[PDB]
Structures are given as C-alpha cells and as structure tokens.
Nucleic acid binder design. Structure first.
Lengths: 732, 366, 133, 732
DNA sequence: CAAGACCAATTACACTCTGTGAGTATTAGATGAGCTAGTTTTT
C-alpha cells in the first residue's frame, strides 16, 4: 500500500522519514504535537491530491524556501492486476495508462520487461512542494495520476474524542466507495410502479402522491452517492467504541473483494473506555483480521489473501499496546516520537517482536509500561525493586521518580532488547560483580564469566585505525584479560582479600561499560545498604524493633513478670527471661506504669547486652558488617554466600557465630532475614525519618544519605543527571 | 411477567394438575377435608395438606409466578430482602410517630380485587376447553371457601403459603395512594403486613390529628379495609413498637436511633441468669422457652427413654443460637445503616459474649 | 395533539442542511400502510435488477446487516426512507416549499394543523416577501 | 464534609447508600451509566438547593410514588467555630441561628453539657422528595437553611473531556466565593482619579475620557462578583492537565483560611494524557495535599490543620489509581459500582489500604489492573502464569480471557484481601494439595499444615442451631480431622499409595472449599500437563524437537554424515553418533535430497530407539509419567520432589535412572527440564496445533482438550461458568 | 356508619365517491431398632 512518508521543513519536521509500515501501527510518545503535525501533513497531502483549496502548512524554519512531502506507494499488486491479460476493463486500462505506461515505454520489451516480471516490487514516488509564495508544485504535471492515487489509496481519519453517534457520514461514504455494483441500471419509474402496486388499492395513488411531492419540492436530482446511500439504507434492516469497531469491521470486510487499499488513522481509541473494553476492541480487531486470512494449509470459503489496509493508532493506554503486541506479533510495530535537542519531531521504532513465546504470553501491564517511559532501570532481584521504588527515598529525589524500575534477567533483557531504542528510551542495567568474575576458596582463581568475555569481545577494537580521543581502551582490555590469575590469597579464612581491592576493579569496569549502559556494583544490594557507615542506624533500627515489636504473651503482665523475675535471674538468665516473656505480636497493649518501666528497663538491658556482645565477639568494626550482610542473604568480597560456604565448608567458626547469634541472640529478627521480607523498606523508612528528625534542610539530608549510602546515591544521581541532560527531548 | 396456557402446562402444574388437563377435566376447588382448621386465640389458620396437588401448585406459584410481579417499596414484609428492621429504619429521620393497624387484613381482601390484580399477568385464554379460563384456574389454588365465614365468597386463608405474596400484590394500589398522600405532606410511610408506621420530621401535629386518621380510613375504604382504634399510637420524640424503640430528640435534621427495650431482652437475661445459677435444664425450658415434651413421648414405640436430657440440651442450644442470630442480625443492620444506639450495641455485644460462653459450657457438658 | 398539531418555523435560525419539519409532516400525514411492503421482496428485486448474478446483492446486504447490530427502523423512519428513494429531489424557498407541502398534504385529511412562522422576512427583498405572500 | 448520600427510586438506584467518604475517593467500574446517574443526582440536589428550575429526575420504577435523595453533612467543625464565645460575627450568628438553633433551645440544661467534650460529632440530614406529580419538597421547610448548606458545602463539577481553555469560569467563581476581603469600601472615584493622575498630560484629562466612555456604554452596574473578578484580573500578572492542576491547586490553597468545605467531582482526569502525565498529576495533588499538613513535629507558617475538601475521581486508567493508592494511603478509597441481576447499580468499597509497606512500595500496574477486573484467578507459580495466559488456549475458550491471572503467595493474598471485595470482583485461589497436607517416608504418617487447620477452624459451624442440609459439614470436618492417621502404605519405594487415592480427597476438599473461593489441585501444575493420556502427544513434542531444534554442526553435511557412518556404527553406536552430529541451532538449513533422507532416517531411528528404551526400562506404562513429572520439577503422589527425594535418600534406583536419561539420552531437553524455561507454552501450542490439524470442529478440539487435560479444562469451565453467571452484572 | 382520593402497563382513513365526511347509488447379606429441631414480625 504505502512504504515511506518523508516530511522536510514543515511544521516540527526537519528531515523526518517514516518507513516499514505493518498492518497495525501504534503511535506512542510524550510529544503529542508531533503526532498532530504528522496527521496535519497527511491530511494536507491528501487534500491537495483531491484539489481542495486549503491553507498551506507552515515551514519549520524561514531560512528554507522549500517544504517537501514525499509519499511512496507500493504499486505492485495493482500493477500485477492491470498487467494480467484476463483483466481488460476500462478502469484497468486507465490505471495501466496513467501509472504503468510512462515507465514501460522506456524499457525494452524483449529483455527489461521480461526481467521485471519477477518477485521484485515496484514503487511510485510523489512529492508535494510548498514554496514561500504559498504555491504548490508536484512531481507529476497531470491531475489524473494524483486523482487516481487519491481514489485508489484513500486516507480515512477517525477521531474518537470528538465523534458524533448520530452522524454516519464516514460509514456511508466508505460503503459507497467500496461497492462493485452498477446502480445506473435501476429504473426509478419501475421501482415507483412496484411500490405503488404493493402499497394500497387504486393503483396509481402513490404515483400521484410522489408526483405532487416532487412538483412541490423540485430540488436537484440525487447524485450517484446519494442514490446508493439511500438504496443501502432501505435495503438494510436497521441503522464511540461501538461505532469505531463497526466501521473498522465493515471496512475490512468490504476491502476483501476490492483492490483499493485504504490507510486508516485512529486518534485516541481508548477515550472513555474501560481497560477491558480496549482489550476487547483489540481482540475483536485481531479476530476479524484472522477470520479473512488464507495462508499455508488454511483455505476454504470466506478466506482471502488480499493484503490488509494499514491502520495507525494514536494510543496513550498500555492495554491497547500490550493487546496489539500479544495478538499480532510480526504484523505490528511501535513508533516513538519524542523530540530533539533544538526542538524537532523524531520517529523511531521500538522493539515489539519477541522470539520467546513465553515472554509473549506472560506479557502484562508491567512490560507494556516500559514503552511509555523516559528512563528504565533494569535490575535482577526483588530487593532492588523494593529499594528503588521506596517512596521516602524518591521524595528527596524527584528526578529519579521519573525513571521506572523493571525486574529482568538476561533472557528478558535479550527479548526486550533495550539497545534497539537507546535515544528514544535511555536505560541502565544494574547488576552485581559476580556475573563477571568467579572466585574459588579451594583454588585461587579469578575466572572470567562468559558475559565478561562477551563484553571484552565487543570492546575489542578490531578492524580499527588510529586517532582515538582519550582513554587507553586497548590497555584496559588487556588488563581485564590478564586479571585471570592465582593471586590475592585469602585473609581471615576466605572472607577478605590480603591486598586486592574490588572497589578499583568495579570502578574500572563501570568506566569501561558506561558506553554499554551497564553499571556493576561492588557488592550485592545488602552491602550497599548495611555498611561500615550505616551501623549506627542499623543498630538504632534494631533497637526500635525491640522496643515496638514484642509484647507480653501472658494476659496478666505484672504477675507474669514478677513470677519470671522470682524464677529466672535478671542478669545471668536475662536471655531465657526475654525469650519466655517477650513474644512477637501485632497488637501492642498498654500496661501499667510499673510494668512499662520494668519492660523499658529490660529492653535497655537487652540492648546493652547485645551491643557489648557484638563489640566483644567480633574482631573490629568490619566483621560485624560482613556478618550482617551474610545474615540477610548477602555476599562477601570473595563472592560467597552462607549457603555456598556451607556447601564448601569455609569460615566454620564465623558460621557457628552466625548460627549462635540467629538462634539465641537475634531470634526476633530471624523472619526478617529473607530477601522477600520487606526489611529493606522498613530500614530505609526508619533511616529517612531519623535523618529528617536530625537535620533540617533537604540538602543536608541528601548529603547524609550520600555519606551513609555511597553506591545507591551515586547511581540515583547518575540517573538523575542523565534524565536532566535528556529531559527537553523526552517531554511534551 | 405473563403466564399463558403453555406456561401452566409444565411449570406450575407439571405433574400435579396434569391428568385433569389432558382428559378435558376442569381443575377442582379445595375440598373441606383437604384442609385443617387450627386455632390459636380468636384466630383460625387454614393448613393445607402437605401431600396434595394444590400445595405443589402453590409452591410453584410462589417460586415462579408470585416472585416477579412488581411491588411497592413501602411493603417491607413477605418480600425477598424485606425485614422488620428495614420497616423501622426510614422513621429515624422523623420527630413524630403514628402507628395504625388494618383489622383482619387477610379476611377483608376481596377475591375480585385479587382477580383484577392478577389479570394483567395472566393471559385471558381458556384452559380446559370452553369451560374454565386460566385466571380462575390459578385462583382456585390460592383461595378457599371458608365454612366459618359462610357463603361470603372465596376468602384468602391466613395459613396458606400463597397468602402473603397475594396480599402484598393486591395491596399495591393502596400502598401507592397512601405513599402519595404522605409525600404531599412530608410523611414517611412504611408497612409491615398490616401495620402502617408514619413518621413526620417537621414540628407539626399532623400525625396526632384526627385528620390523618380520617384520610387513611377514607383511602382504605376504597378496597374495603378498616383500621381498629385499639392499637392507634401517636407519640412524639419516642415510639415503642413491640419492644423496638425509635428515639429522636428533635431538630431540623437530627438523626434518630433504634434500640431494643429491656422488656424485649428480659427472657434471654432470665435464661442466662438461670444458667449462671446452675438451674437444672428441666425447668429452664418448660418455663422460659415454652418447649415441653408431650405425653405421647417416643412415639409410644421405644423403651430406652432418656431422650428428655438430650432434648433439653438440643432445644436450649437451638434457642441460644437463634437468639444470637437475632442479635447479630441487629448488629449487621447497624453496620449497614448506622441507626442503632452505641450503648445498645455494646450491651448486645456483651450479651452475645455471654450466650457464646453458655453455649460452649453446654457443649462441653455434653 | 394528533388532530390539531402545532408547527413552529423560525426563519432567522433555520438550517438549509436538514428537512426535519418536512419529513415529520410526510411521515405523520399519510393515508397509506407502509407495512404490507416487506424488506425481503424489495431486496430480491434490487438484486435481480442491479448487476452481476442472482443473489450477490442479497448476500452483500445480509453480510452488511449481520455485522452492524442496528435496531430496526421505526415506521416514521421507514416511510421517510421510502419517500426519499421514491422522489428525485433532496430561506424563502424552504419556507414556501414547506407551506406548499403542508397544504397539499392537509387537503386530503381531517387533520387541521396550526403553523406559526416567526420573522418570515429576514434577509429578504421586499419583492421577495410580496412574492412569498 | 458529607458523610452519607442516599438515593432511593431514582434513575438507576433502588436503594443505594454511600458512606465513609475520604479526601481522594476514587470511582471505578464498567457501569458508566451508574456514575453518570450519581453525578446527575448530586447536580440535581445542589441545583434544587439553590432554587433552580430544573427537570425532575426519573423514577427507577413507576410503582413507587416517592423518590428520595438524602444528604448527611458532618457539621462538627462549623458547630465548634460558631459555638465559641470569641466569634461574634454576623455570618457566625446567621449560622448559629438556622442550623444549630432548633436542637438547642428545646433541650434542658443537661444535654448540651455532654456536647462540649470535644469527642462527639454532629450530623445534619436533608432529604429531597420528588413526588409522582413532578412536585419536589424538603424535610425542612426553610430556604435559608438550604442556602446556608449550599454556601458552606458547595459542589464543583469539572469535566476534562469537554473543557474550554478560553473560559475560566470555575477559577473566577472560586476566587469570588473564597475570599476574606471586603470590596465595598473601594471608592471608584478615587481609583479613577489615581489612574488619571498616573497618566496625565494636564490636570484632569483621563476623567473626561472615562466619563465619555461610561456615557456611551451605559449599562447595568457591575455586581460584586464582577467587581472582585476585575480587581483580581488587574491585580494578577497573568490570565487540559495543566488547567485542571492549576484549578485544583488554587482551590486547595484558597481552602486554607476558610471554613467552607467544597466538594469536587472530576470526570475522566486522564483523557488525552500520557501515563506519566497522569502519575505526575496525582503526585502534584499529593504534594499540595502534604505541603499544607501539620502533624506534631511538623509546624510553622504555611501549614494548616483545616480538613481537606472531598475529591471524587472517575478514572479508567490504572496509573491514577496506582498513584492514589501508593501516595495517599489511608486517605483514599475505591468504589466499584457494577450492577445487579435485575439491573440496578451497586456501590462497594474495594480494599485499597495495605498494612505491608513493601507491598505498597512495590505496587505496580498489575496490582492496579486487578481492580479493573471481573474475575481474578490467583495462582502460586510462574508455570501457572504460562499455562493460563496461553494465547493458543484462550481462543478456544472465549470466556476465560475475561479473567485475569495473578501470581500471588499467601502474603500478597492477605495484603490484597480479595474476600473484602467478593460480590464485586469474584475470585478463585488455585493452590496445590501440598499446602494442606504433608507426608514423610521416614515417619509414615500424614500431617496437617496450619492452613488446613485454619480452614477447618473457619468451617467449624459452632454457635449454630439445627437446619436441614447443614448436617454433613460436621461429618466432613471430623473426617478431615481423622485422616491424620499413620495407616497409609506406600509401594514402589515410597512413590505411590497402596490403597489411598488422593483424587477422592482432593475432590472432597474442593467440594467443601468451594464456598471459600479456593480450588486445590490433586498434584502440582506439571501433573495436569504430563499425564497418561498426554503421553503420545508429549512424545511427539520430543520428536518435534529432534526434527526442529537440533541441526547438523558441520558446514558440509554429506561428508560429515559419511565420515560418521564409516567411523561409528549405525546401530550399536547410534547414540554417540546422534550426540556428535546434531547440536543446538536456531537456523534450519536445507540440505540435498539424499542428505535430507538420511537425516530423516536417523531421526526416526533415534525416536524409535528412545521409545523402545522408555517402554522397556519401565513396564507399568505409568512410572514414565512420574519420571517425566519429576524431571520438570514436579511431585509424586507422596508429595516429594526430586530434590526432596535426593535429600531424603529415597528411590535411589529411580534417581539413578533419571540421571542416566538426563545425562545420556535426553540431554537436548536438559535446558527445558527446568521451571521458567517456556516448555509449557511450547507443549500447549504444539498439542493445540496437532489437535486442530486432526479435529475439524472447535467443539471436537475442546472435547479432546478436556480428555487430555481434565483438571485444566475443568478449572477453565468452572471459571467460565462463574463469569457467565454474573455476566449481566459486571458489564456496562 | 360512610367517604372525595380507585396502581401501572396493557401508528394507523376505508370508502362506491379519489375527495368527502351525505347525496344516494351501485350492485350483486431385601425381616429388633431409634429418636427433637431456632429468634422475631405479621398473628
């Protein structure tokens, strides 16, 4: 039908070109002005095709004297129809003479015409030129070609926001233009006589009535359009979303037996519609699309092989987009508009075809939301989703609130393929350092993962020349290649590195992979949360949990407390008393003043005891951080977890210390030591509240957060800087 | 809905009145020996035999026919979804209250009114040849000629299962007339069976005036209904209807409250107190619960006996559970409408806790 | 209401793109019975007289109707459509045609309507108003 | 501050009561007619408050002569404002002369002493009655009371689909009504003199021009509203989403020093808006809501404790609902309307407050999509998401597509609490039997999980009387209690049951738990797919892989095949040859005819060999089903997985056979033998394609699917029946 | 006693006359068992 649309120096388009049109085309983007301007360009071109006096479009810049609109039509099916010897009608000969005759006389019939009769496609290019003096120039200097193109590849525009339910003009126009019946053979007098014979007695009374009516009114005779519309209205037994669906269905049904291939543009198909209604609309469109398909073994009556008309959608709803993707697949595309740096509409294609059927079926609203995004943060793990979606943290960083976070593994990333649309949708993939380097305690070896080798191969400057601006890329690649060795011996029984530092390697990897839209963290997200600087806040959170978590199991608090004090020692047997008195409970009943004082004293004593035991058990204020990290499913600097250490058998004494602390000392926190336990959200909220209470201005709070959380604040600030650097283009 | 001959062929008379339809037999009326004439006070209840075609026809009428005819919203009784609490709810907005009762409501319903009310919903076509129509065939299973009331026509029995729906359907013109009359004067009207409750929010003496009674009587005289002056109650700021107290302090939009007086809950408190005093179950059910074994115990067939103890456990559990259901229906009504006193709510919560404890004790003892 | 109908014609705020009073008068003021006429035969005849083979136009109409889900026309709409098909035609001229049609229709019926025309001379030459009268 | 709106017998309402209104009340549902009717009722009530000649609303049914609209206003703040001694103002006296006057003068000196405890709330009820004769009357016959109620609690309606940007009528109305300045003291002559002095070539030059202009345009004098509007316009320096946001901000800012409590209704705030735009709108609303809030430590200028006006939303976009739930939290509610069986609008509150902060923070588009649903199927596992979202299966059942599949564990289900919204959004929770009962090989005894005991406790109908039919529930509960016996013999090394059948127990559990919206499967999700009747098709699927997913590695196929045949035996060494010839490759190159024939022969020989080995190693024809089930992370009838069996040291020979098939024969299927590998989607697609090829009619295809997959089709049919039972209710 | 107010829901011109609303005038394992039944309103 149509292949390319090129707009130069008109409205907001500078050198914009649109190509590769599928059966269904979805237009999305935050720049509504671009979509409106494209619609205006198309409508102006089709109005000038039909010779309608309309105001010429405005130029993008007045320093250009020419504005071009270029339309390329795929005139391959119609060429085959008119070339065939069987078809020799008046219209076929007219089409052949006005389009496929000028290009045929210039080609030899013995060789060129024989060679062109193959699977190759033929295109017709038409250019509209607007000059400074409001003058219109055409590539072809004859109205017949333009008129035939207008009546052969028509453009229909449907606006749902401003639609009339009582108006059926587009439907009747389309029905009249999609009829293969000659209505000139119908005799008006015979029809009037037939009506008169079967209306009443005294044959001729209805004829006299009609004669009187026409003699009184005496208006212009009905045109062919009016006559066919009236005949259709009488023949049929009767006459927002329903109107659009009916029009689209009748258009698809009536184009099965006609060579006319229209172009439909629907603006906002989801206004005033339930999400289920939009999904049902797309489902009905796909059902009627597939009802008239004759491919491979699928055949029989009611099946047509005619190409479907091109349909364009201006949608702001993820439901329509996801249904279109899941239902069509290879027969759809997604267009993102956005803008440029100086201000100019773009048109890019976002990946919508997936080779994984599982991803296509699982596809839900979360996946469809990535299309309507300006910055995507890709994470592997639900803990990162909890951290980056924290409302308290996002309140202090409004810029990062504009970026949406998606949980994807390598398979989901490969299916989505964010690299296809980088300018349209900037993205960053946040991963951990264990997907690049592998370490073993039994054998000293810094092995390289296949992903790291693939990155090295991609960054290998083969088939290249000199004149590199800055950065010893080759030296960095060589150093990363030779890092595989048997050095950096263990320290403290496979828990630290004697001299090697992962911070420098992580920084180098991040610097190299900035151009790859990838960020690798030094440790897991737990290491970024609980570090040597956040220990006071983690201890305060533990104290708050102790204070406002456990209650008295016994209905009578005073009697139970007195009995336990008289039975269990308050100093030597403090732990058994705490275990047998305080229990985890959602409700927090209010006790007496003496009972509350005793409970507060016991809680303070327990806090002091645990703090003293932690300080006097571990060596320095570094093993506490590692112990807490491994407690919450974390990793050490040797890339080992508690489960992996158990399967291996290293750091047995430290593992016994952890088991003793979990089973005896910290038993109320045991349910919160899981990844899907929500401890991240609670800890972040408590830290934010405490910092807000201490400091006054928001800048001080942000500085304190940067001091406490280096990596999280660093990545948030980097994403915010990227967003603010590319905010003008990705904003309407 | 509309019922034609085919509808009555295999829905309302699928098996019972089938042999009469095929063999050109007119559907008979209800014989004297086919009903019982039980008595309670100065009231006669007509009980139809369980094993009878008319009983099945009445069940099918109540399930399929007398369930789709539109009724008036003021009819809060004998209607799916209606309740006494919904009958008393609309009057919380009023300051003055008036209670009236129709005398012998079921006995004063003329059969001609029932026929004319059911005519639009039944096709006027002959059923059994040119002998009997379809409307009278339906009516023969609804009414009954009362020998006590002489040959005064087919009086609607007070014990038939089809009587309440027929009464509510026939009392729709009167409901509309009374509702319109009260609307013209700003009076809220609600009817339960034959008790009509009128509420006036404005500071006026319309409900305590003789004009209101005269107008209600004049309206009711269209269909032949009277109201007895024995139970005409007109009060202000508080009214007690069978223990249900509606109280509104008055104002220009103040919200009233609905509670239950201690007289209504006296029996359950007495039962709970007796259970607290370890009173034996022999005299806690034959005195308070008015349930007692007859002389013809164990059907005069068994010899083990000892069923008295388990009967006095079962029936007591059933009474406690039923009254608990009543109280929690009250609290759910409060949750739905928010028109019940808070102190009454906490009191019934305590009573419910006591009833649950006593039920647990009884079940532990067994 | 149906024996003494009232019609109001505002010439100042009239629209030339609609003929609502005319079609209302045509539908209401008739002595025929547009019920004996049946859609099936109408179609059958149109299919026989239109083009191509037999039944093609009937299949086209059936497939259009089966996928449109439209309620059937009322009697007034049906008679309006029949009149529109049976005729060959679609401020002062509009008013004159409306009055002439109404008089002609009301010359064979006992219905006696009452017309009220507001400002019959807006945007008219004095000769045009005299010619209208 | 309204607290109750009651509509009886008007439009589409029979008896509808709305309560517990909050700041950000949101309205969702497919019954748009209900929302329109509610808006019409509110607008009619507020028009009749101001004595406007409007058409009375139609009755729901004509068998009622009364149509009532009841409005209850929370007159607690106003009463406290006007009761205080230091509020001697004309308007304050007017308020405490018409509203709080009838309820005070008629009481003694004791009732009012209980109204000054700062704990009670005062309610004012106003009822509008429409009679059958189009006559309307009120409960209170005092126009002053109605006018004061309209002034104190005004209603604002904002329409975004049809909004005029040029006219700013709501803004100027709010500015004029919400002010604390008296403009009657302004001297017009003084202002004109000042303007003349500002621009004066001579003394008294602009005065004569003003006088001439007034004389030549002399009309009606300006009203107070016009004067204040003009003064605001000359005082200010400046005149879809932006307009509405500015109006909402202005209304919020104005209602900070006024006791007027407006009511705001906004219809479709997201029409023609990008999802990010709607999210930003809700975020800005939350920011302006929180900026003017003071709580304990939060104080200082610019923050007020004035209650916020009630805001009503009518949104079809999940983005607005998601942001409202995430940001506002406890200060919002969601109202679902739907319909009844006979046809009548309902109103039900959907759960929108969550006690888990993690769930609120990670709240996403799927969770907001669950509220725009008519049937939710809750599943635990991504395999169920793959199976129930399969496109090739939903087309054959055009009734289960209306149901939305959500993956949720027990915690997510508890947070969502689907039981709260049961009559509005029907739901089914699909779980496995293993979540109810557990089995141990070492200690041959059943055990009951806490979930099953909790369900039994919920089903124990104590505190109940005797009713017919409700007698077998106690027997079923007793049986479910006593099935805890240890008498259950297991054969085949603890893989099957000698006499016990889990099918009957699962059927009984499903029958008793139907009332709790729970369905428990006999086996795991892989059990319903890999069964005896699916053995042929499954095998064919394997063959498909051997014919599709494995291609020759060598670039020259003929030479490599010849070398392998001359080197490796075709019969004894067939397995090594197959392993060394065919590898993993997406491309499917076409070879020579002889090469294709040889490859087809080799593939057929390998398929026959594997079929024979499978039928020979296992004899009962059923142990293969269990082997395949445990291969794809399944379970046995003893509720044991392959990993659990390995840890428990049971069926050593079976594990050895499984290892032999995995590492020796079915090595190509090893990537697909894990969860989330997409094997479910491929298997369903292949089975459905084969059945479509075999059976012609769709009913035959559905019957064959029911035969091969009994449990899946049973669940689908049950859900479809549940949907179609309430189809007329949950549909616009 | 006797009573105003008694529900709602259930596109059309035949005629001889083709124009009129009459005038006429056409016209023709089958055999000991052995069992109760809620609260409240109407009533």
């Amino acid at each position: 039908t149509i292949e390319s649309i090129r707009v130069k120096n008109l409205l907001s388009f500078d050198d914009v070109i649109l190509r590769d049109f599928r059966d269904i085309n979805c237009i999305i983007g935050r720049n509504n002005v671009g979509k409106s301007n494209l619609l205006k360009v198309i409508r102006y071109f089709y109005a000038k095709l039909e010779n309608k006096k309309v105001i010429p479009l405005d130029f993008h810049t007045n320093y250009n004297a020419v504005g071009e609109i270029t339309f390329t039509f795929d005139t391959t099916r119609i060429k085959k129809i008119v070339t065939s010897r069987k078809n020799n009608g008046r219209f076929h000969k007219h089409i052949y003479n006005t389009l496929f005759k000028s290009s045929s006389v210039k080609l030899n019939f013995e060789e060129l015409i024989a060679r062109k009769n193959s699977t190759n496609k033929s295109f017709f290019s038409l250019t509209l030129t607007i000059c400074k003096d409001d003058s219109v120039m055409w590539s072809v200097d004859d109205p017949k070609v333009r008129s035939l193109l207008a009546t052969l590849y028509p453009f229909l525009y449907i606006e749902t926001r401003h639609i009339d339910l009582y108006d059926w003009n587009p439907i009747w126009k389309l029905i009249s233009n999609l009829n293969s019946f000659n209505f000139d053979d119908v005799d008006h007098d015979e029809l009037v006589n037939f009506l008169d014979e079967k209306i009443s007695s005294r044959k001729g009374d209805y004829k006299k009535y009609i004669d009187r009516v026409v003699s009184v009114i005496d208006t212009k005779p009905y045109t062919y359009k009016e006559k066919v519309i009236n005949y259709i209205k009488v023949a049929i037994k009767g006459d927002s979303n329903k109107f659009l669906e009916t029009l689209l269905h009748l258009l698809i049904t009536l184009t099965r037996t006609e060579f006319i291939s229209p172009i439909v543009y629907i603006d906002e198909p989801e206004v005033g519609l339930h999400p289920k209604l939009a999904e049902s609309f797309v489902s009905n469109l796909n059902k009627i699309y597939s009802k008239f398909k004759k491919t491979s073994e699928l055949s029989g009556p009611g099946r047509y092989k005619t190409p479907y008309p091109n349909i364009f959608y201006s949608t702001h709803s993820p439901s329509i987009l996801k249904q279109t993707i899941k239902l069509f697949g290879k027969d759809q595309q997604v267009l993102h508009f956005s803008k440029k740096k100086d201000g100019s509409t773009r048109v890019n294609k976002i990946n919508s075809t997936y080779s994984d059927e599982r991803f296509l079926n699982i596809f839900s609203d979360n996946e469809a939301r990535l299309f309507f995004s300006e910055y995507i943060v890709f994470v592997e793990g639900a803990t990162e989703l909890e951290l980056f979606r924290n409302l308290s943290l996002l309140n202090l960083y409004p810029a990062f609130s504009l970026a949406d976070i998606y949980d994807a593994n390598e398979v989901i990333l490969a299916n989505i393929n964010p690299g296809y649309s980088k300018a349209s949708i900037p993205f960053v993939i946040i991963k951990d350092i264990d997907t690049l380097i592998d370490y073993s305690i039994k054998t000293e070896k810094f092995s390289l993962r296949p992903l790291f080798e693939k990155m090295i191969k991609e960054l290998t400057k083969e088939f290249d020349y000199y004149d590199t601006g800055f950065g010893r890329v080759r030296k960095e690649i060589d150093l990363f290649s030779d890092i595989q060795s048997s050095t950096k011996k263990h320290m403290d029984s496979g828990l630290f590195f004697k001299r090697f530092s992962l911070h420098n390697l992580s920084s180098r990897i991040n610097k190299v992979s900035r151009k790859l839209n990838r960020y690798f963290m030094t440790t897991t997200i737990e290491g970024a949360l609980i570090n040597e600087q956040s220990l006071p806040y983690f201890f305060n959170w533990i104290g708050d949990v102790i204070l406002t978590q456990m209650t008295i199991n016994n209905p009578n608090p005073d009697k139970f407390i007195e009995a336990m004090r008289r039975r269990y020692n308050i100093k030597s047997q403090v732990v058994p008393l705490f275990k047998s008195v305080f229990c985890i409970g959602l409700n927090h009943p209010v006790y007496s003043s003496a009972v509350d004082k005793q409970a507060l004293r016991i809680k303070l004593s327990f806090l002091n005891y645990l703090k003293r035991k932690v300080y006097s058990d571990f060596n320095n204020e570094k093993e506490i951080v590692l112990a807490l990290r491994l407690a919450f499913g974390g990793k050490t600097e040797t890339q080992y977890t508690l489960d992996k250490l158990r399967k291996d058998g290293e750091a047995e004494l430290f593992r016994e210390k952890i088991k003793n602390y979990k089973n005896n000392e910290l038993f109320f926190l045991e349910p919160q030591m899981t990844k899907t336990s929500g401890w991240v959200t609670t800890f972040l909220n408590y830290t934010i509240e405490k910092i807000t209470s201490e400091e006054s201005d928001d800048d001080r709070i942000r500085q304190k957060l940067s001091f406490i959380f280096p990596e999280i604040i660093s990545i948030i600030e980097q994403a915010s800087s990227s967003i603010e650097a590319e905010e003008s283009s990705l904003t309407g | 809905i509309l019922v034609d001959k085919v509808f009555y062929e295999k829905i309302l008379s699928v098996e019972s009145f089938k042999e009469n339809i095929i063999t050109q037999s007119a559907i008979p009326k209800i014989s004297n020996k086919e009903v019982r004439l039980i008595s309670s006070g100065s009231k006669i209840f007509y009980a139809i035999n369980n094993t009878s075609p008319h009983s099945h026809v009445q069940l099918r009428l109540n399930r399929f026919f007398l369930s789709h005819i539109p009724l008036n919203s003021a009819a809060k009784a004998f209607v799916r979804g209606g309740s006494y609490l919904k009958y008393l709810e609309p009057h919380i907005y009023g300051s003055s209250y008036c209670r009236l009762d129709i005398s012998s409501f079921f006995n004063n319903i003329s059969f001609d009114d029932v026929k004319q009310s059911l005519s639009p919903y039944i096709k006027d076509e002959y059923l059994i040849g040119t002998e009997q129509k379809l409307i009278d065939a339906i009516l023969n299973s609804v009414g009954y000629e009362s020998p006590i009331r002489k040959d005064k026509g087919m009086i609607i029995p007070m014990g038939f299962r089809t009587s309440p729906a027929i009464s509510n359907i026939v009392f729709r013109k009167m409901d509309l007339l009374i509702q319109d009359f009260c609307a013209k004067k700003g009076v809220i009207y609600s009817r339960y069976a034959d008790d009509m409750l009128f509420s006036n929010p404005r500071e006026s003496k319309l409900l305590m005036s003789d004009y209101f009674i005269d107008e209600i009587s004049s309206l009711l005289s269209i269909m032949g209904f009277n109201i007895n002056q024995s139970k005409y109650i007109s009060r202000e700021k508080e009214i007690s209807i069978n223990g249900y107290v509606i109280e509104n302090k008055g104002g220009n939009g103040s919200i009233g409250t609905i509670r239950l007086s201690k007289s209504k809950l006296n029996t359950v408190l007495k039962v709970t107190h007796a259970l607290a005093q370890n009173i034996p179950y022999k005299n806690i059910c034959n005195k308070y619960i008015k349930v007692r074994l007859k002389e013809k115990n164990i059907k005069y067939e068994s010899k083990k006996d000892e069923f008295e103890k388990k009967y006095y456990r079962d029936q007591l559990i059933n009474y406690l559970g039923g009254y608990r259901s009543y109280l929690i229906s009250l609290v759910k009504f409060h949750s739905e409408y928010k028109c019940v006193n808070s102190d009454f709510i906490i009191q019934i919560n305590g009573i419910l806790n006591d009833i649950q404890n006593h039920i647990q004790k009884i079940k532990k003892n067994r």
